Amino acid sequence: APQDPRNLPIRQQMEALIRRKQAEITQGLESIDTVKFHADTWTRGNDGGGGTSMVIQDGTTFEKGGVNVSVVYGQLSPAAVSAMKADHKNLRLPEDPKTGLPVTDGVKFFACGLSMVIHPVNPHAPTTHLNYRYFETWNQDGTPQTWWFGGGADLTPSYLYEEDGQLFHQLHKDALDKHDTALYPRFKKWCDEYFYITHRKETRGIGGIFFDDYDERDPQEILKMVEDCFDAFLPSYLTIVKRRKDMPYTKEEQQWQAIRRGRYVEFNLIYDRGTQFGLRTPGSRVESILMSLPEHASWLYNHHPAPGSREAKLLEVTTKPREWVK
Amino acid sequence: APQDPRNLPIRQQMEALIRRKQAEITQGLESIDTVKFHADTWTRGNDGGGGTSMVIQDGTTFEKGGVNVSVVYGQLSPAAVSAMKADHKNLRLPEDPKTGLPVTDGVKFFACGLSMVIHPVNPHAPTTHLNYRYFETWNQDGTPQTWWFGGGADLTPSYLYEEDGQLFHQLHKDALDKHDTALYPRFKKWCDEYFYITHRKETRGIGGIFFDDYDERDPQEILKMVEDCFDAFLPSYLTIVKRRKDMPYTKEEQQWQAIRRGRYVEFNLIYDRGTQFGLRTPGSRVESILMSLPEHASWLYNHHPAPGSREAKLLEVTTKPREWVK
């Protein structure tokens, strides 16, 4: 289940939206590689829900890539609450932990979303990430409480190309602008902040759009915005990878890709909430949650790119995020 | 400084000890290798203390290794706290403003310590971690609150060799048998518990000893214990490394070293308090803390060792720890 009729339409049409796009996206990535996505489907430990994971490995274009769909429901663990959304506080009960803790206990929840991470082989071809999800919570008596959408997509180059960042930001802007023109400077700036690797004083990439706890329209209207946002990814991502995958590259450009990949691990393991949520919801498939991580990464002690270099030019943008749109 | 007289001598002696070990341990590791440690001495942002970090890289025996000595003091931040100690609670504090928040704010700390992680080139040459430290706190009024010691050492093979585990545990058991025979079984199981990668259902290695929160004997006595432990290190690990450093290896054993390095990253960035503490203490040097990260790690999707393989043998010990002394 859950059967709760009040919002069940939106629940079923979001699941159906993300299953359609899982197919459509894998098919589209496959068209610029020579390898196919492999399926595996899992369940939480039953009546918990589960998902279908699609995975690509050892391609000619894509070294590793996952497009995971996840439909999950039941008891909301206290451990995982803070990583469910940005503002865990719309919610809350004082359910009194019997000796000495205050704040959290015995709630029912539902989440359904798509999660995607693609790492190309070629250092000139950027990593990317995309997510669209819907949450729902219910009061301990079984009554509605809130619901919300989240998502966005973002781009993680190791070598920067203005034309890539521009096209990526534009198409998602374009998509958001069909709904409300204030959405994209809003979700853009958010993307800039959310993927900040606090201890490194830099973002992992160059952003895109990011939103969470978004219940600000009819959920039907948020659904058509989600669909549109989905549609900005393939025309931007495919285009970008076609033009970078055959760019020439050196061992030193690989090294730097691996180092930024290390940056990517640090983000996903320390600050990423999707990851935290998943790792802390009972029964979840670790292999699926952790498909976000590259096949390889490196850490060097006290590395600084030679000055004026392209590597430094990435760090310029990653310490002070810039704009990419018109 | 701090010049607070009561426990000043211990603080200054712990320090004297850890710098002697830092020097002799690094000398030791340089001996079974043909590359030298690079020292650099850093400052926490002034009157916060500092540290002397020592990093070895790109040598014949050891791929990446650091020996960090760290003498640190000042304002204790809210966030640094849960990762100071196993059990923080022995410390306390409200102070209720207008309808608003009791818990804590301002109090003052001292930490001095040696931290170590060594990552050999050879997949058969195991990773090792070592830590001995002293921690102190003052009450809001400036009076002495607590001090304690935390520490120990553990072993992290990718390829299991029972003689290495026995040597390593034994020599550390001997160091503590000196002080009280009962500590070893206590600290040994502690080591099995702390290095568990909850989401992977397995420890990072085969452990050794770990203790935290320790003030059970008088500090003078603890310091001798801590110094006995130190000496258990080099005669195991150097003996252990001298004999695996030259075993032959395949690319596939190298891939398994890389996968087990990925597991180690997972532990460091999600569960390790020493890492948390440094990244959450203002002005601690990030490159010092995260030197514990392997130069290289890999993540493969849904990877399983073949039944009865050496690789699978690790996992038997890793998912269910065992004894190494008779």
Side-chain angles (χ1 to χ4, degrees):
Chain A
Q3 280 193 68
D4 197 78
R6 186 241 174 65
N7 257 315
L8 192 44
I10 287 284
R11 295 216 290 286
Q12 281 188 302
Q13 291 137 43
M14 182 53 179
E15 210 205 334
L17 173 56
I18 68 188
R19 289 193 179 286
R20 192 202 318 146
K21 297 289 173 190
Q22 181 170 59
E24 164 175 22
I25 288 163
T26 38
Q27 185 98 257
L29 292 162
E30 281 170 356
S31 77
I32 59 157
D33 208 315
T34 50
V35 126
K36 306 314 173 276
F37 286 84
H38 282 49
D40 60 68
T41 287
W42 56 276
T43 61
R44 269 174 80 224
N46 260 260
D47 255 34
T52 289
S53 289
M54 294 298 322
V55 163
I56 200 170
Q57 299 188 66
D58 193 43
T60 41
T61 303
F62 300 120
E63 174 163 68
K64 195 172 177 210
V67 185
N68 286 359
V69 156
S70 187
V71 187
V72 137
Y73 40 76
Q75 344 190 162
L76 180 60
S77 179
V81 169
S82 62
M84 275 200 303
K85 30 149 66 247
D87 175 357
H88 53 295
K89 255 282 225 145
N90 309 36
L91 306 147
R92 210 210 323 156
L93 327 74
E95 279 152 309
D96 30 84
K98 302 168 192 190
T99 303
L101 246 182
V103 164
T104 331
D105 182 88
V107 174
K108 290 153 161 185
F109 107 91
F110 158 113
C112 108
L114 188 153
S115 197
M116 182 187 340
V117 193
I118 311 297
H119 306 273
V121 172
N122 190 306
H124 300 279
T127 280
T128 184
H129 161 265
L130 179 149
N131 184 305
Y132 294 104
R133 57 184 177 291
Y134 174 72
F135 271 83
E136 205 153 292
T137 44
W138 287 269
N139 292 308
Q140 174 176 7
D141 74 353
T143 316
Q145 172 168 26
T146 7
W147 56 260
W148 71 89
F149 284 75
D154 60 272
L155 194 60
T156 304
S158 297
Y159 290 86
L160 199 53
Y161 306 93
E162 208 151 283
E163 31 162 340
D164 294 352
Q166 292 181 301
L167 171 68
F168 197 103
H169 285 269
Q170 196 58 68
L171 294 175
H172 295 261
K173 171 154 190 281
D174 292 346
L176 280 184
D177 289 355
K178 289 161 193 95
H179 292 268
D180 178 287
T181 64
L183 289 180
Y184 172 86
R186 190 187 154 183
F187 298 169
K188 196 285 196 184
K189 176 173 72 188
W190 201 340
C191 197
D192 284 341
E193 301 159 353
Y194 182 79
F195 292 108
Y196 189 67
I197 310 162
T198 300
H199 73 270
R200 296 300 182 160
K201 302 143 163 204
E202 63 181 297
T203 60
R204 64 183 195 182
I206 58 180
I209 52 167
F210 181 96
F211 61 103
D212 200 353
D213 324 354
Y214 194 79
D215 61 352
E216 289 182 20
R217 291 298 336 175
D218 168 45
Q220 279 299 133
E221 288 171 54
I222 296 165
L223 268 173
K224 189 73 47 158
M225 188 197 62
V226 170
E227 166 152 21
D228 277 313
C229 279
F230 264 116
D231 302 342
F233 172 81
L234 244 23
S236 60
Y237 198 57
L238 292 190
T239 307
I240 293 174
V241 183
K242 289 199 280 196
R243 65 199 194 200
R244 304 304 156 202
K245 78 182 177 65
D246 290 322
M247 280 188 75
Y249 77 75
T250 55
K251 135 179 198 154
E252 309 88 68
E253 300 166 345
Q254 269 192 287
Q255 188 191 228
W256 175 250
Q257 184 196 48
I259 282 159
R260 305 299 307 169
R261 258 110 132 104
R263 290 287 201 275
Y264 208 82
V265 172
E266 292 179 18
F267 182 81
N268 275 26
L269 296 187
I270 308 157
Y271 313 94
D272 191 58
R273 293 206 259 90
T275 296
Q276 284 149 15
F277 189 63
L279 285 173
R280 295 187 211 144
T281 125
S284 67
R285 201 162 172 265
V286 185
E287 285 305 329
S288 302
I289 282 80
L290 253 28
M291 81 72 171
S292 87
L293 301 176
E295 205 211 335
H296 307 295
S298 286
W299 288 267
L300 274 73
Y301 174 68
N302 198 34
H303 181 282
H304 309 287
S309 73
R310 292 165 309 160
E311 290 82 1
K313 295 213 203 70
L314 174 59
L315 303 185
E316 282 168 33
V317 164
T318 234
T319 56
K320 181 167 160 211
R322 51 153 289 184
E323 303 301 288
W324 309 87
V325 91
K326 315 317 256 270
Chain B
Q3 256 128 23
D4 201 273
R6 192 266 194 67
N7 302 298
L8 180 46
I10 289 315
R11 295 206 299 270
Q12 289 175 324
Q13 293 179 52
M14 183 58 160
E15 172 161 353
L17 167 63
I18 70 198
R19 294 195 175 274
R20 174 167 38 117
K21 299 298 162 191
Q22 177 186 53
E24 68 186 37
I25 289 179
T26 52
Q27 228 203 172
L29 308 164
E30 293 175 335
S31 68
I32 70 173
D33 194 332
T34 92
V35 136
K36 299 290 183 273
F37 275 97
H38 176 263
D40 63 55
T41 282
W42 58 279
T43 224
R44 201 178 135 245
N46 290 16
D47 258 8
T52 303
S53 300
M54 290 187 81
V55 148
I56 191 180
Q57 54 199 321
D58 196 327
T60 38
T61 302
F62 302 114
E63 191 176 67
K64 205 214 257 196
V67 193
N68 294 342
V69 147
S70 184
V71 182
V72 121
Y73 40 81
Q75 291 159 316
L76 180 65
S77 148
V81 158
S82 65
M84 267 189 323
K85 284 170 98 271
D87 169 41
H88 45 283
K89 264 274 162 164
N90 324 139
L91 280 58
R92 223 258 264 106
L93 274 209
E95 52 175 42
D96 302 26
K98 281 178 75 222
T99 332
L101 318 184
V103 251
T104 332
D105 311 74
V107 136
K108 301 226 283 134
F109 83 103
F110 172 99
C112 84
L114 180 155
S115 209
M116 181 186 38
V117 194
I118 310 292
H119 298 289
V121 185
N122 202 287
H124 306 286
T127 270
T128 191
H129 163 257
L130 180 142
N131 195 288
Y132 296 103
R133 61 192 181 285
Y134 176 91
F135 255 108
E136 195 163 345
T137 59
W138 288 268
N139 296 114
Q140 193 155 31
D141 69 332
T143 51
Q145 176 39 93
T146 344
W147 60 263
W148 68 98
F149 292 81
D154 54 280
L155 207 58
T156 299
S158 294
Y159 291 100
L160 193 58
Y161 302 108
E162 208 191 45
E163 39 171 328
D164 287 356
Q166 293 177 324
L167 180 58
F168 186 85
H169 284 241
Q170 200 44 81
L171 294 201
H172 288 269
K173 186 174 172 275
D174 292 353
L176 302 179
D177 274 343
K178 288 205 177 57
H179 297 266
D180 163 359
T181 62
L183 291 182
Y184 176 88
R186 194 177 138 207
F187 289 2
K188 179 279 170 184
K189 187 191 57 167
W190 213 345
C191 199
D192 292 344
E193 282 167 334
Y194 176 81
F195 295 114
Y196 189 62
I197 310 164
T198 299
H199 66 269
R200 295 299 192 160
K201 300 166 174 165
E202 77 178 281
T203 59
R204 77 190 187 176
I206 63 177
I209 59 160
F210 170 92
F211 55 93
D212 214 342
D213 300 39
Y214 188 70
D215 53 12
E216 300 205 356
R217 295 292 171 274
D218 79 39
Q220 272 305 128
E221 209 185 311
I222 299 182
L223 263 194
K224 185 73 81 204
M225 188 196 79
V226 166
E227 183 174 17
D228 296 338
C229 295
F230 262 110
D231 297 327
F233 179 68
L234 222 41
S236 35
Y237 197 64
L238 289 191
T239 285
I240 288 178
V241 163
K242 250 179 292 228
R243 63 178 179 210
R244 310 304 187 200
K245 86 187 222 65
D246 304 296
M247 289 167 96
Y249 58 81
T250 143
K251 145 183 268 192
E252 284 85 23
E253 287 167 335
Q254 203 159 2
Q255 170 179 273
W256 173 255
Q257 172 190 72
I259 289 166
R260 296 311 303 186
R261 264 102 133 111
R263 286 292 195 288
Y264 200 93
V265 176
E266 274 177 48
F267 189 88
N268 275 19
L269 307 180
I270 310 186
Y271 305 99
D272 189 64
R273 293 206 264 90
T275 302
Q276 273 158 25
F277 184 74
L279 293 175
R280 304 213 220 125
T281 53
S284 308
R285 199 161 158 279
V286 173
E287 290 291 347
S288 290
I289 296 97
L290 291 186
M291 73 89 183
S292 66
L293 298 181
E295 216 200 321
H296 310 294
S298 298
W299 287 265
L300 307 220
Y301 175 75
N302 207 30
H303 176 84
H304 308 274
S309 53
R310 290 177 296 126
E311 287 80 16
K313 295 238 203 319
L314 194 65
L315 299 193
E316 288 166 20
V317 130
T318 250
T319 59
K320 221 213 161 209
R322 46 161 281 195
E323 310 307 337
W324 301 81
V325 30
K326 357 279 262 284

